[PDB]
Design an enzyme around this catalytic site. Structure first.
Site, PDB file in Angstrom:
ATOM      1  N   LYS A 269       5.559  10.416 -11.772  1.00 34.66           N
ATOM      2  CA  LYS A 269       4.465   9.455 -11.858  1.00 34.66           C
ATOM      3  C   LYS A 269       4.058   8.972 -10.473  1.00 34.66           C
ATOM      4  O   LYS A 269       2.869   8.793 -10.190  1.00 34.66           O
ATOM      5  CB  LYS A 269       4.881   8.282 -12.739  1.00 34.66           C
ATOM      6  CG  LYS A 269       3.802   7.237 -12.937  1.00 34.66           C
ATOM      7  CD  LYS A 269       4.273   6.149 -13.899  1.00 34.66           C
ATOM      8  CE  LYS A 269       3.151   5.191 -14.272  1.00 34.66           C
ATOM      9  NZ  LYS A 269       3.473   4.417 -15.509  1.00 34.66           N
TER      10      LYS A 269
ATOM     11  N   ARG B  46       1.965  11.774  -8.871  1.00 31.45           N
ATOM     12  CA  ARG B  46       0.629  11.870  -9.435  1.00 31.45           C
ATOM     13  C   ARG B  46      -0.248  10.702  -9.004  1.00 31.45           C
ATOM     14  O   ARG B  46      -1.427  10.886  -8.677  1.00 31.45           O
ATOM     15  CB  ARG B  46       0.726  11.933 -10.953  1.00 31.45           C
ATOM     16  CG  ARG B  46      -0.627  11.889 -11.607  1.00 31.45           C
ATOM     17  CD  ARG B  46      -0.506  12.093 -13.092  1.00 31.45           C
ATOM     18  NE  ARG B  46       0.263  11.033 -13.723  1.00 31.45           N
ATOM     19  CZ  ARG B  46      -0.239   9.863 -14.113  1.00 31.45           C
ATOM     20  NH1 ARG B  46      -1.524   9.584 -13.926  1.00 31.45           N
ATOM     21  NH2 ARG B  46       0.554   8.966 -14.676  1.00 31.45           N
TER      22      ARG B  46
ATOM     23  N   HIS C 208       0.135   8.656  -6.323  1.00 32.98           N
ATOM     24  CA  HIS C 208       0.060   8.242  -4.936  1.00 32.98           C
ATOM     25  C   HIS C 208       0.019   9.334  -3.881  1.00 32.98           C
ATOM     26  O   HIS C 208      -0.236   9.009  -2.718  1.00 32.98           O
ATOM     27  CB  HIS C 208       1.245   7.327  -4.621  1.00 32.98           C
ATOM     28  CG  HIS C 208       1.278   6.103  -5.465  1.00 32.98           C
ATOM     29  ND1 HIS C 208       0.271   5.166  -5.439  1.00 32.98           N
ATOM     30  CD2 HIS C 208       2.159   5.684  -6.402  1.00 32.98           C
ATOM     31  CE1 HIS C 208       0.540   4.207  -6.305  1.00 32.98           C
ATOM     32  NE2 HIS C 208       1.692   4.489  -6.890  1.00 32.98           N
TER      33      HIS C 208
ATOM     34  N   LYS D 235      -7.463   1.763 -13.902  1.00 32.20           N
ATOM     35  CA  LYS D 235      -6.391   1.166 -13.118  1.00 32.20           C
ATOM     36  C   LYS D 235      -7.030   0.349 -11.997  1.00 32.20           C
ATOM     37  O   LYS D 235      -7.861   0.877 -11.252  1.00 32.20           O
ATOM     38  CB  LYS D 235      -5.457   2.225 -12.540  1.00 32.20           C
ATOM     39  CG  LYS D 235      -4.180   1.628 -11.971  1.00 32.20           C
ATOM     40  CD  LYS D 235      -3.280   2.676 -11.330  1.00 32.20           C
ATOM     41  CE  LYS D 235      -2.014   2.009 -10.810  1.00 32.20           C
ATOM     42  NZ  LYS D 235      -1.377   2.724  -9.677  1.00 32.20           N
TER      43      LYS D 235
ATOM     44  N   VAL E 171      -6.093  -1.084  -9.062  1.00 30.50           N
ATOM     45  CA  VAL E 171      -5.749  -0.891  -7.663  1.00 30.50           C
ATOM     46  C   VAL E 171      -4.809   0.298  -7.561  1.00 30.50           C
ATOM     47  O   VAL E 171      -3.886   0.437  -8.369  1.00 30.50           O
ATOM     48  CB  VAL E 171      -5.087  -2.157  -7.073  1.00 30.50           C
ATOM     49  CG1 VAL E 171      -4.585  -1.880  -5.668  1.00 30.50           C
ATOM     50  CG2 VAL E 171      -6.066  -3.325  -7.111  1.00 30.50           C
ATOM     51  N   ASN E 172      -5.032   1.148  -6.569  1.00 36.04           N
ATOM     52  CA  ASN E 172      -4.128   2.274  -6.387  1.00 36.04           C
ATOM     53  C   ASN E 172      -4.258   2.792  -4.970  1.00 36.04           C
ATOM     54  O   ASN E 172      -5.366   2.913  -4.457  1.00 36.04           O
ATOM     55  CB  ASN E 172      -4.430   3.410  -7.372  1.00 36.04           C
ATOM     56  CG  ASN E 172      -3.370   4.492  -7.344  1.00 36.04           C
ATOM     57  OD1 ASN E 172      -2.235   4.267  -7.730  1.00 36.04           O
ATOM     58  ND2 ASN E 172      -3.744   5.674  -6.891  1.00 36.04           N
ATOM     59  N   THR E 173      -3.134   3.143  -4.362  1.00 37.74           N
ATOM     60  CA  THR E 173      -3.123   3.677  -3.009  1.00 37.74           C
ATOM     61  C   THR E 173      -2.718   5.144  -3.024  1.00 37.74           C
ATOM     62  O   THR E 173      -1.751   5.517  -3.693  1.00 37.74           O
ATOM     63  CB  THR E 173      -2.138   2.910  -2.122  1.00 37.74           C
ATOM     64  OG1 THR E 173      -2.500   1.533  -2.091  1.00 37.74           O
ATOM     65  CG2 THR E 173      -2.119   3.470  -0.705  1.00 37.74           C
TER      66      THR E 173
ATOM     67  N   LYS F 297       8.331  -6.928  -3.156  1.00 38.74           N
ATOM     68  CA  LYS F 297       7.637  -8.157  -3.524  1.00 38.74           C
ATOM     69  C   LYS F 297       8.331  -8.885  -4.665  1.00 38.74           C
ATOM     70  O   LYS F 297       8.302 -10.121  -4.720  1.00 38.74           O
ATOM     71  CB  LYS F 297       6.194  -7.852  -3.931  1.00 38.74           C
ATOM     72  CG  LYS F 297       5.260  -7.512  -2.784  1.00 38.74           C
ATOM     73  CD  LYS F 297       3.840  -7.273  -3.303  1.00 38.74           C
ATOM     74  CE  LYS F 297       2.836  -8.279  -2.742  1.00 38.74           C
ATOM     75  NZ  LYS F 297       3.271  -9.697  -2.895  1.00 38.74           N
TER      76      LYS F 297
ATOM     77  N   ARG G 102      -9.814   0.334  -4.993  1.00 43.58           N
ATOM     78  CA  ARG G 102      -9.884  -0.908  -5.749  1.00 43.58           C
ATOM     79  C   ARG G 102     -11.154  -0.955  -6.572  1.00 43.58           C
ATOM     80  O   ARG G 102     -12.238  -0.657  -6.070  1.00 43.58           O
ATOM     81  CB  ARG G 102      -9.855  -2.130  -4.842  1.00 43.58           C
ATOM     82  CG  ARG G 102      -8.541  -2.345  -4.193  1.00 43.58           C
ATOM     83  CD  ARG G 102      -8.289  -3.815  -4.042  1.00 43.58           C
ATOM     84  NE  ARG G 102      -6.948  -4.020  -3.534  1.00 43.58           N
ATOM     85  CZ  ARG G 102      -6.161  -5.036  -3.860  1.00 43.58           C
ATOM     86  NH1 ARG G 102      -6.567  -5.947  -4.721  1.00 43.58           N
ATOM     87  NH2 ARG G 102      -4.952  -5.109  -3.332  1.00 43.58           N
TER      88      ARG G 102
ATOM     89  N   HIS H 128       7.898   3.754  -6.814  1.00 44.32           N
ATOM     90  CA  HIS H 128       6.910   2.683  -6.903  1.00 44.32           C
ATOM     91  C   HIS H 128       6.331   2.453  -5.518  1.00 44.32           C
ATOM     92  O   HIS H 128       7.057   2.490  -4.523  1.00 44.32           O
ATOM     93  CB  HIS H 128       7.562   1.425  -7.501  1.00 44.32           C
ATOM     94  CG  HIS H 128       6.858   0.136  -7.201  1.00 44.32           C
ATOM     95  ND1 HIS H 128       5.757  -0.302  -7.905  1.00 44.32           N
ATOM     96  CD2 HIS H 128       7.141  -0.839  -6.303  1.00 44.32           C
ATOM     97  CE1 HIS H 128       5.376  -1.477  -7.436  1.00 44.32           C
ATOM     98  NE2 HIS H 128       6.196  -1.822  -6.459  1.00 44.32           N
ATOM     99  N   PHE H 129       5.013   2.227  -5.463  1.00 53.89           N
ATOM    100  CA  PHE H 129       4.338   1.887  -4.210  1.00 53.89           C
ATOM    101  C   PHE H 129       4.225   0.364  -4.174  1.00 53.89           C
ATOM    102  O   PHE H 129       3.533  -0.229  -5.005  1.00 53.89           O
ATOM    103  CB  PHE H 129       2.962   2.552  -4.118  1.00 53.89           C
ATOM    104  CG  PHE H 129       2.373   2.525  -2.741  1.00 53.89           C
ATOM    105  CD1 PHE H 129       1.634   1.437  -2.313  1.00 53.89           C
ATOM    106  CD2 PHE H 129       2.570   3.579  -1.870  1.00 53.89           C
ATOM    107  CE1 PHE H 129       1.100   1.408  -1.043  1.00 53.89           C
ATOM    108  CE2 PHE H 129       2.041   3.552  -0.603  1.00 53.89           C
ATOM    109  CZ  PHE H 129       1.298   2.466  -0.190  1.00 53.89           C
ATOM    110  N   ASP H 130       4.917  -0.277  -3.225  1.00 55.28           N
ATOM    111  CA  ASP H 130       4.950  -1.737  -3.200  1.00 55.28           C
ATOM    112  C   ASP H 130       3.791  -2.331  -2.402  1.00 55.28           C
ATOM    113  O   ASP H 130       3.139  -3.274  -2.855  1.00 55.28           O
ATOM    114  CB  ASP H 130       6.292  -2.217  -2.620  1.00 55.28           C
ATOM    115  CG  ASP H 130       6.676  -3.611  -3.087  1.00 55.28           C
ATOM    116  OD1 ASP H 130       6.809  -3.823  -4.309  1.00 55.28           O
ATOM    117  OD2 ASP H 130       6.867  -4.496  -2.227  1.00 55.28           O
TER     118      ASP H 130
HETATM  119 CL   LIG Z   1      -0.747   1.176  -5.320  1.00 56.07          CL
HETATM  120 CL   LIG Z   2      -1.651  13.495 -16.046  1.00 56.09          CL
END
Ligand SMILES: [Cl-]
Ligand SMILES: [Cl-]
Ligand SMILES: [Cl-]
Ligand code: NA
Length: 124
Positions: free
Chosen positions: A7, A10, A12, A41, A43-45, A66, A85, A119-121
């Protein structure tokens, strides 16, 4: 049923480009990575480095997440990233995103064996 590591990849990883060079990058990438499927979604980086370089952050600077957990790691070097965003006028299913390209340190949470990002913090 997706593993946590898959995940993260996919959501990040975008190693195929060195940077977002278009205002429409986020609209296209949020769609193609299936982050607009049932909802937008917000927000995503995306990180524009090799997977190996991002996985290596799990052996770099140990910092707090965080949420207070202590399995976060900050990259020693800056990395090419794109923050995506939702705009104020976006709403499902016509998700719309602002694209902001930057070079920043990334902070990831790592878990597992192998010990990899899950996880992207944040980015700094
Ligand atoms: Cl993110
Ligand atoms: Cl997928
Ligand atoms: Cl230290
Ligand atoms: Na995993």
């Amino acid at each position: 049923k997706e593993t946590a590591a898959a995940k993260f990849e996919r959501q990040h990883m975008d190693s195929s480009t060195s940077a977002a060079s278009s205002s429409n990058y986020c609209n296209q990438m949020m769609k193609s990575r299936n982050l607009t499927k049932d909802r937008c979604k917000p927000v995503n980086t995306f990180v524009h480095e090799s997977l190996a370089d991002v996985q290596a952050v799990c052996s770099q600077k140990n910092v707090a997440c965080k949420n207070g957990q202590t399995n976060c790691y900050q990259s020693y070097s800056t990395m090419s990233i794109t923050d995506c965003r939702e705009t104020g006028s976006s709403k499902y299913p016509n998700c719309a995103y602002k694209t902001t390209q930057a070079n920043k340190h990334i902070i990831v949470a790592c878990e597992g064996n192998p010990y990899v990002p899950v996880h992207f913090d944040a980015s700094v």
